[PDB]
Amino acid sequence: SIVTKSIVNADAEARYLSPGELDRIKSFVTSGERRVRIAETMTGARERIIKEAGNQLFQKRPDVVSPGGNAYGEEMTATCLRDLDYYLRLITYGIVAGDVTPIEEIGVVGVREMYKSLGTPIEAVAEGVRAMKSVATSLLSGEDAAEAGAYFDYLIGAMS
Amino acid sequence: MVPLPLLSYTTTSFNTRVAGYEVPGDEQPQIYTAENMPSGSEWDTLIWAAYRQIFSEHQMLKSNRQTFLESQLKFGQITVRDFIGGLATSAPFLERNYQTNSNYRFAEMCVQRILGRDVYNEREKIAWSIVIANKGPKGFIEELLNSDEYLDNFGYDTVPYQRRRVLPQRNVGETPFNLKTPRYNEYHRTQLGFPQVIWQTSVR
Amino acid sequence: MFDAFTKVVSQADTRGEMLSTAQIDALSQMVAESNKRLDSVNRITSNASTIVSNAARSLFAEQPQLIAPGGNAYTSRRMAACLRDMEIILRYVTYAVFAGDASVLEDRCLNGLRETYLALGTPGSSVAVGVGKMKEAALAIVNDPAGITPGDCSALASEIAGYFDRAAAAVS
Amino acid sequence: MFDAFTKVVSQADTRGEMLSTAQIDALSQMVAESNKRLDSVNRITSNASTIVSNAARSLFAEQPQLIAPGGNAYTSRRMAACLRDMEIILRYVTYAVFAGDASVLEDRCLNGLRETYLALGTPGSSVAVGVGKMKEAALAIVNDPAGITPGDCSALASEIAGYFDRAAAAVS
Amino acid sequence: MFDAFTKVVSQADTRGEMLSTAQIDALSQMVAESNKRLDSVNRITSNASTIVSNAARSLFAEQPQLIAPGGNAYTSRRMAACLRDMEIILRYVTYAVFAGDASVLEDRCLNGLRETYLALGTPGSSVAVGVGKMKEAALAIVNDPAGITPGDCSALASEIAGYFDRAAAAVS
Amino acid sequence: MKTPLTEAVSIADSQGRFLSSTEIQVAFGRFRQAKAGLEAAKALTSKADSLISGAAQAVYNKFPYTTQMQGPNYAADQRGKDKCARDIGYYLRMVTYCLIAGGTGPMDEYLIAGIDEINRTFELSPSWYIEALKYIKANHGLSGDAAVEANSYLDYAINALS
Amino acid sequence: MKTPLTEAVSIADSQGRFLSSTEIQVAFGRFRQAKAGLEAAKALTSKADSLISGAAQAVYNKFPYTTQMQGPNYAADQRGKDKCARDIGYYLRMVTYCLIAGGTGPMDEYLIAGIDEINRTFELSPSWYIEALKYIKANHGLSGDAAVEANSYLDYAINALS
Amino acid sequence: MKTPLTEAVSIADSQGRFLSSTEIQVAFGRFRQAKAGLEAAKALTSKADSLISGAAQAVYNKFPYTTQMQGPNYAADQRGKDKCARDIGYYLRMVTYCLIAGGTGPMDEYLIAGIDEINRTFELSPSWYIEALKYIKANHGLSGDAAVEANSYLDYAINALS
Amino acid sequence: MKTPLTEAVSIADSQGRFLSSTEIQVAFGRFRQAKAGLEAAKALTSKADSLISGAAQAVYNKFPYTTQMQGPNYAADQRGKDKCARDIGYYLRMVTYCLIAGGTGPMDEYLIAGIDEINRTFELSPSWYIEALKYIKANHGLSGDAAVEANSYLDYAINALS
Numbered sequence A: 001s002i003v004t005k006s007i008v009n010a011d012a013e014a015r016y017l018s019p020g021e022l023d024r025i026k027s028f029v030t031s032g033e034r035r036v037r038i039a040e041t042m043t044g045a046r047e048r049i050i051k052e053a054g055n056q057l058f059q060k061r062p063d064v065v066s067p068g069g070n071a072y073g074e075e076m077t078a079t080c081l082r083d084l085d086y087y088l089r090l091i092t093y094g095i096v097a098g099d100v101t102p103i104e105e106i107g108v109v110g111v112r113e114m115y116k117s118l119g120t121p122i123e124a125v126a127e128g129v130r131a132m133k134s135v136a137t138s139l140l141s142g143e144d145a146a147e148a149g150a151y152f153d154y155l156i157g158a159m160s
Numbered sequence B: 001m002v003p004l005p006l007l008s009y010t011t012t013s014f015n016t017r018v019a020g021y022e023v024p025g026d027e028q029p030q031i032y033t034a035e036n037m038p039s040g041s042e043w044d045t046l047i048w049a050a051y052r053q054i055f056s057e058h059q060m061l062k063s064n065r066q067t068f069l070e071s072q073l074k075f076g077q078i079t080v081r082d083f084i085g086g087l088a089t090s091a092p093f094l095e096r097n098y099q100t101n102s103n104y105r106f107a108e109m110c111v112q113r114i115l116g117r118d119v120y121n122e123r124e125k126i127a128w129s130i131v132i133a134n135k136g137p138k139g140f141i142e143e144l145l146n147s148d149e150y151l152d153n154f155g156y157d158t159v160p161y162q163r164r165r166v167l168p169q170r171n172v173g174e175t176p177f178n179l180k181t182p183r184y185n186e187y188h189r190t191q192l193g194f195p196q197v198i199w200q201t202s203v204r
Numbered sequence C, D, E: 001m002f003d004a005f006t007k008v009v010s011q012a013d014t015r016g017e018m019l020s021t022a023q024i025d026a027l028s029q030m031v032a033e034s035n036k037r038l039d040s041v042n043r044i045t046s047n048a049s050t051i052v053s054n055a056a057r058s059l060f061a062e063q064p065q066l067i068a069p070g071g072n073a074y075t076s077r078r079m080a081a082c083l084r085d086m087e088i089i090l091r092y093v094t095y096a097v098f099a100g101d102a103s104v105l106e107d108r109c110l111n112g113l114r115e116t117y118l119a120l121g122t123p124g125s126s127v128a129v130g131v132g133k134m135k136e137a138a139l140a141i142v143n144d145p146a147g148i149t150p151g152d153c154s155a156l157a158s159e160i161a162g163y164f165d166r167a168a169a170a171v172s
Numbered sequence F, G, H, I: 001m002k003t004p005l006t007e008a009v010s011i012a013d014s015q016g017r018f019l020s021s022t023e024i025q026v027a028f029g030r031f032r033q034a035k036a037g038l039e040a041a042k043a044l045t046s047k048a049d050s051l052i053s054g055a056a057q058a059v060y061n062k063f064p065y066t067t068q069m070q071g072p073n074y075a076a077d078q079r080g081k082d083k084c085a086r087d088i089g090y091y092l093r094m095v096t097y098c099l100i101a102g103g104t105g106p107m108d109e110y111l112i113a114g115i116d117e118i119n120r121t122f123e124l125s126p127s128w129y130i131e132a133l134k135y136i137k138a139n140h141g142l143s144g145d146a147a148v149e150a151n152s153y154l155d156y157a158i159n160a161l162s
């Protein structure tokens, strides 16, 4: 939530909520209906937004689908559907909270040791995310392409 | 079994629903009718127009040609309507257009090709999709060809066409249905593991 | 669906006045060169099957990925559909240079076929290069005066290359 | 596609119980005034061609840009289509005040015709003003007494002006 | 659906040989007089509404039983259908004298309309007399020359009266 | 939803014309009907609970096997009786809805359109509902023209059942 | 032939069902209409000849050019007046036929369906017939609800004309 | 927009084939037509204003009642004369547009397609426009084959009117 | 039978209208075409037998295997040469028929419509007929616009073949 780290940034200074910050927590609530419907579209079209975008990963990086690889076969690119669905899940949780702390609680800081233990290069995964950003904004409106993609650019920078 | 009625749907505003106070001009669809006792060459043009309407131009292959249906039509054993039903129920149509689409998209494609209009709303596609599920694709096409809308516009002897694509004062009309609704959508394209990306740039 | 004459008529009606004199001299010169337009059109039309076969011949020599299995034009049915798509594009080019207006080419192909090739998974780049090569071969076939009186095809090479580039850019 | 009675029936079925008594007294008063609703509907219906001609007569006196060349209702065909669009709107208003529900007017016109006028390039403002003037003239034609027994038509002027304002706002 | 030229082509193909020389001289004279036919046809075409109104005008003066109540052309709808039937017959006569062959007139009207008028209860005699009077007025309108270069319309008068008598006899 | 005003609008719309005197004749007739039908619907609303219990008891009386044999379709247990009398009240409520609406539309859309396949899938005999509707049309206690058209709606439900 | 009983049968046939209470509501309404409409049609039958002559004289009064200019469409000669007053009597007879039939069907089938193309082909202005129908609806001399629905049919003819 | 090249492209497109010698025959014929028709259209452009005023005066002469009676459809006031002569100039401009285009397409799309319902709604007699077109086709002053096909277009407008 | 006058009548019939100036433009163009085309067809009729033998010899020259291998599709025996030169004369006769008719209709109805399946069933290469038509269009010896449209018809046959 945009509340709970504006709490944390006001806690370390030992201060109450400033009225300049208090408009930001006011305008989030009155625009909370605008973000839940664009998070409904990612909830509804979650199957289409991973299936063609996974082929955009393998078109641009076909090293993964090669034999002797990390994610090879009908059952291991199945695990890429069993892994990239969580990143498509968590961006919706980044939208409805208003900021990046559901991203930051689940899938950021351990991924340097996660994918090393998995043996997958992270930037191979990250270019699948940046190609997914190019196809997520095909569904979004011209207004909502920035703000729903604003939580995408935190995830691309977290992998890289 | 009590016949389940077609699910009700709301109508949309379309050019085909209003009277057109128009003088015939170059944008009017050429009407192919069997009523005028067509010459042997005119039968081939009517048959060609019916294949173009139901299959699309890219599906007019020698292997898709229904030679028995064409001889029945040329002999007057079947109507142009029955010929359209025979084309829409043919093996090459069902293989290429039914098996590569969902019931909703197949219903939209058949409404556009057989009734010569667009679908009013998504609820009309849902209402026709249950007919396809219960009666199969054949019983759906028969119900579409038995609609008052088909009979009032084309009768038994006229080949279907895209009704009122262009307004008389516009050089640009609506998109031709064959370009609007290609053989399959993005969903079946992703299943085929096809085009999109198939090159690795360069080595450096 | 517009001619040259209907284009001037629609513009003069949107102006609301009669046709001005300079437009009538332009249309008189158009009526003088409309047959000239036509000679290229008929010698373009007579070699159409050779044009599309040579265009696909150079294209599939150039991009062998389309012929390769898994390619978009690999399957025999799909390859026949590929040649059909090319022949359709050439035919509507010949129609547009018949009527002397690009509005027929726009109306019949352009607005839908880009979305069609996106939805089909058809690579727009290869068919764009094929329409470009077909247009280059078409002007090359038109410009050679074999058994034809000496004239000037300048502006009509201009117009035909315009129509082909409009088709290739609307394909993308 | 709903009546007044079918509206009460659908609401009572969504409640899942029988119809309450006060709704039945309301429907009894509706059955008493339903003829009152519709004699006027009949005097609205009989003058419909005069209503649409006077409405277009005042509208094209008011906005001469539509009659001007290049205007949206300039062409004879387009002007006939304009009068057809207005007559259709008046007819569905008469249907909705016949059945006593706005759901028929919604169903038959409203959801599509706004997008239709956007896509056509039709100015929604002029047809909105025309439907407003037509509705004002319709209540003005309905309210006068010329050989009819006097009655209080206050809630039916209310309802008819409601239907006309719903049409004019759904047009926009 | 045949021309003069396609008629000679079909006859020469049924013979199986090339076209003989005398048929080519006949077709050359036909090409010389085909405009002659065209000029006559155009002055027939321009007065078509006057022709059908004068034909129905004389016919319903002649047979007042059709206008009488219970008559076949009594009802306003039926009378409009009557004028439509006559105008259709005149139009296909003009088509047949355009193409120079009676096969278009046969194809489009003759084989079905006799049975149609039997099944409808339409008296074939009145419409036969009306087509005869319309044809007489059509040749009378064609044969007079006003502001036209002198030409022999006489060869055509034979052919046009042939087409009209074929229509009137196929109606019966 | 076959109600007279709705179908009059459907006729005038499918013909593509305005309203004529025919629909106004339909209207003065419909108001004549509703002028007694609304009060008759209120009277049925008053007598509804006792009519439902009497219909259920008559159905148990004519078909005593349904109270005896074990089976989830039969009303031997108590939940069968709750659901059973619930669909008795459903039938009576649809009768009152058609009395208010002035046509067979509400029962045709809420009851009739799927009742045959439901009784086929659930092993429900429609004769039970025929007996219940016969008891209701015998015991509703109305009089006059309201009673005749109430019996008309109930007989329509009977003919739609079997 | 849009008459109420005919269109009720058409509704019940196109739906594929039996007759319901809706058609009986249509019927008691139609009988209510006919119970005055038949006597009003008889009264119009009585006053018909004077109404026809008065309408023709009012039409000659408002449009005096038609009596003056030579032309076979105009009623300058006597045969124009015979044919003219004949179609006045045609209009009045169709009004009485719709009064008996109870709907706009007879005028819609005998007058309206081709009147536009006939007036187009024959150079007849429909405003002449509008003036005549206005004179008839002013001078028919009926009273009450019969007069209102007679004016309804005449106004329907006027709106169908222009 | 029925112009010869447009309809040739429509024939070749509906047949699904390339262009043949038939369309080239259509083309050398169309160029033969335009080679006089463009200069004739320029000559009509020159004589247009006097032709419009002469047609309006002939229409006021043959139908003198339109100048006299009060009515917004009639040209009794001045705004009727402005709008009136405006639609005279409309008819003449459509004649010149069809002379340039080489077919009846522009008048068929700009005038004919709705003229019947407009004259029905507005109480305009089409005979006024027939008289004006007759005066124009008498007084245009062209000669030869251009004059004959100009008269062809005007007679086509007359036959489309009545 | 795609000939210009026939397709003009088909356009005017499918539109449901009379003939306009468009068809007369088509007609003066068609007469302009026929005014040289008939004499060119007579000249081809004169040179026909030598053209047929020269085309057959050029076909045997470019494809010498057909004279050598045993096979009933090949013209190794004499009956193959009789039938072969018979279909050479067939192609030339269809060229003359399209020259007279003024359109590609006769070859489209007599040759093109089934030629693909016939060459598929009979193991005839269409390139033989392409070589023969190329020899004919090289050696017909006409000049001018008649020669260009003759080459147009022959090139149309070539494009229809392959």
Ligand SMILES: *[C@H](C)[C@H]1/C(=C/c2[nH]c(/C=C3N=C(/C=C4\NC(=O)C(CC)=C4C)C(C)=C\3CCC(=O)O)c(CCC(=O)O)c2C)NC(=O)[C@@H]1C
Pocket: B056, B057, B058, B059, B178, B179, B182, B183, C066, C072, C073, C077, C078, C079, C081, C082, C083, C085, C086, C088, C089, C108, C109, C113, C116, C120, C122, C123, C124, C125, C126, C127, C130
């Ligand atoms: C070859 C140049 C390129 C190519 C062509 C290709 N196209 C298709 C399939 C379709 N093409 C169209 C295009 C049109 N239809 C029209 O009606 C018009 C204008 C009149 C156009 C431009 C359509 C609708 C389809 C789908 C339906 C069909 O039968 O053809 C294919 C086949 C795809 C398939 O799965 O069948 C091909 C191969 N594609 C390439 O690879 C080249 C780049």
Ligand SMILES: *[C@H](C)[C@H]1/C(=C/c2[nH]c(/C=C3N=C(/C=C4\NC(=O)C(CC)=C4C)C(C)=C\3CCC(=O)O)c(CCC(=O)O)c2C)NC(=O)[C@@H]1C
Pocket: C032, C033, C035, C036, C039, C040, C042, C142, C143, C144, C145, C148, C149, C150, C151, C152, C153, H021, H024, H025, H028, I145, I148, I149
């Ligand atoms: C263009 C790339 C080359 C070129 C052409 C050119 N043509 C002409 C003139 C004519 N061309 C024709 C051709 C036809 N007329 C027909 O009816 C048909 C059948 C469909 C054909 C093939 C004709 C007849 C003319 C004019 C009349 C005549 O020749 O009798 C010209 C000059 C004249 C003009 O502008 O029309 C030219 C220049 N010339 C080149 O140098 C180009 C390489």
Ligand SMILES: *[C@H](C)[C@H]1/C(=C/c2[nH]c(/C=C3N=C(/C=C4\NC(=O)C(CC)=C4C)C(C)=C\3CCC(=O)O)c(CCC(=O)O)c2C)NC(=O)[C@@H]1C
Pocket: B013, B014, B015, B016, B017, B018, B019, B020, B167, B168, B169, B170, D066, D072, D073, D077, D078, D079, D081, D082, D083, D085, D086, D088, D089, D108, D109, D113, D116, D120, D122, D123, D124, D125, D126, D127, D130
């Ligand atoms: C006059 C008030 C305004 C106006 C009207 C106008 N409308 C059109 C064209 C269309 N209007 C419709 C609207 C409907 N169709 C329906 O079926 C229904 C409900 C049953 C409605 C409300 C449609 C579909 C069209 C396009 C197809 C057609 O024939 O009519 C035009 C003409 C546009 C054209 O290019 O032909 C006009 C002029 N426009 C104005 O200028 C006024 C503001």
Ligand SMILES: *[C@H](C)[C@H]1/C(=C/c2[nH]c(/C=C3N=C(/C=C4\NC(=O)C(CC)=C4C)C(C)=C\3CCC(=O)O)c(CCC(=O)O)c2C)NC(=O)[C@@H]1C
Pocket: D057, D060, D067, D074, D075, D076, D079, H059, H066, H072, H073, H074, H075, H079, H080, H081, H083, H084, H085, H087, H088, H090, H091, H110, H111, H118, H122, H124, H128
């Ligand atoms: C004088 C020539 C005669 C006459 C004319 C008259 N017409 C109107 C009103 C309209 N006229 C048209 C006609 C056209 N509009 C077009 O766009 C075209 C083709 C380009 C034509 C032929 C239309 C659409 C109208 C209605 C628009 C409007 O009301 O302004 C009037 C004004 C009467 C009116 O309110 O409706 C007049 C005076 N009337 C005569 O008396 C002369 C014999």
Ligand SMILES: CCC1=C(C)/C(=C/C2=NC(=C\c3[nH]c(/C=C4\NC(=O)[C@H](C)[C@H]4CC)c(C)c3CCC(=O)O)/C(CCC(=O)O)=C2C)NC1=O
Pocket: B007, B103, B126, B127, B129, B130, B131, B132, B133
């Ligand atoms: C061949 C594949 C295919 C499917 C899957 C399909 C589903 C489908 N179910 C529908 C309705 C329905 N489907 C349901 C089912 C349910 N609703 C519930 O309450 C439960 C959760 C669930 C029972 C398991 C219901 C109740 C409707 C009726 C909605 C209505 O009629 O308003 C409709 C609307 C049209 C109609 O039934 O008559 C479609 C198209 N149609 C098809 O052609």
Ligand SMILES: CCC1=C(C)/C(=C/C2=NC(=C\c3[nH]c(/C=C4\NC(=O)[C@H](C)[C@H]4CC)c(C)c3CCC(=O)O)/C(CCC(=O)O)=C2C)NC1=O
Pocket: D035, D036, D039, D040, D042, D142, D143, D144, D145, D148, D149, D150, D151, D152, D153, D156, F021, F024, F025, F028, G144, G145, G148, G149
């Ligand atoms: C379908 C053919 C038909 C018509 C047309 C018809 C109309 C009609 N309107 C009536 C009453 C009435 N109608 C009105 C209407 C109005 N009074 C006003 O001052 C308002 C402005 C206006 C409504 C906007 C009134 C006030 C009455 C009084 C009687 C009543 O309540 O019915 C009555 C009652 C009985 C009678 O008058 O004899 C009839 C007959 N009846 C028919 O059978």
Ligand SMILES: CCC1=C(C)/C(=C/C2=NC(=C\c3[nH]c(/C=C4\NC(=O)[C@H](C)[C@H]4CC)c(C)c3CCC(=O)O)/C(CCC(=O)O)=C2C)NC1=O
Pocket: E066, E072, E073, E077, E078, E079, E081, E082, E083, E085, E086, E088, E089, E108, E109, E113, E116, E120, E122, E123, E124, E125, E126, E127, E130
């Ligand atoms: C393309 C060729 C073609 C022809 C020839 C044709 C004739 C034709 N004339 C018909 C009716 C008619 N035809 C006539 C004509 C006449 N009856 C008379 O009393 C006079 C003797 C004669 C006037 C010359 C009439 C009055 C009707 C109306 C019958 C009816 O509507 O009941 C009908 C019945 C359907 C309908 O008009 O709307 C057809 C099919 N239809 C065609 O498609």
Ligand SMILES: CCC1=C(C)/C(=C/C2=NC(=C\c3[nH]c(/C=C4\NC(=O)[C@H](C)[C@H]4CC)c(C)c3CCC(=O)O)/C(CCC(=O)O)=C2C)NC1=O
Pocket: E035, E036, E039, E040, E042, E142, E143, E144, E145, E148, E149, E150, E151, E152, E153, E156, H144, H145, H148, H149, I021, I024, I025, I028
């Ligand atoms: C499609 C538009 C169009 C028309 C209308 C047209 C007509 C037309 N008729 C012509 C000739 C002619 N037309 C006629 C016709 C007749 N003379 C009589 O005395 C008879 C009564 C009548 C036939 C029934 C005659 C006699 C000629 C003499 C020149 C010639 O043979 O063409 C000519 C020769 C060239 C010219 O006049 O400049 C033209 C243009 N040409 C066109 O491009």
Ligand SMILES: CCC1=C(C)/C(=C/C2=NC(=C\c3[nH]c(/C=C4\NC(=O)[C@H](C)[C@H]4CC)c(C)c3CCC(=O)O)/C(CCC(=O)O)=C2C)NC1=O
Pocket: F059, F066, F072, F073, F074, F075, F079, F080, F081, F083, F084, F085, F087, F088, F090, F091, F110, F111, F118, F122, F124, F128
């Ligand atoms: C509003 C219109 C409407 C009707 C009519 C209706 C009937 C209906 N009755 C049902 C079951 C039932 N129907 C009965 C009724 C009976 N069995 C007996 O033995 C008695 C003779 C009779 C008592 C009246 C019973 C006991 C059940 C529960 C049996 C079951 O599991 O399916 C079910 C299946 C739902 C379920 O299983 O609970 C439906 C849909 N539903 C509706 O929505």
Ligand SMILES: CCC1=C(C)/C(=C/C2=NC(=C\c3[nH]c(/C=C4\NC(=O)[C@H](C)[C@H]4CC)c(C)c3CCC(=O)O)/C(CCC(=O)O)=C2C)NC1=O
Pocket: E057, E060, E067, E074, E075, E076, E079, G059, G066, G072, G073, G074, G075, G079, G080, G081, G083, G084, G085, G087, G088, G090, G091, G110, G111, G118, G122, G124, G128
């Ligand atoms: C039963 C329904 C019905 C109607 C309405 C009808 C009208 C009708 N009126 C006609 C003519 C006519 N209509 C009129 C009428 C008038 N002209 C005037 O100047 C006066 C203002 C007005 C007098 C009322 C006249 C004078 C004619 C004869 C003109 C003619 O030759 O066409 C004609 C053409 C028949 C003929 O020429 O004799 C028809 C069909 N026919 C019908 O069957």
Ligand SMILES: CCC1=C(C)/C(=C/C2=NC(=C\c3[nH]c(/C=C4\NC(=O)[C@H](C)[C@H]4CC)c(C)c3CCC(=O)O)/C(CCC(=O)O)=C2C)NC1=O
Pocket: I059, I066, I072, I073, I074, I075, I079, I080, I081, I083, I084, I085, I087, I088, I090, I091, I110, I111, I118, I122, I124, I128
């Ligand atoms: C009027 C238009 C027309 C055409 C074009 C036509 C072609 C035609 N050529 C045929 C056979 C043939 N076609 C050829 C021709 C050739 N083979 C060669 O080696 C040479 C290269 C070439 C010489 C030109 C030969 C030799 C036959 C006989 C082979 C057979 O049994 O089928 C046949 C099968 C009939 C038969 O078996 O006798 C047809 C239908 N028929 C027609 O009616």
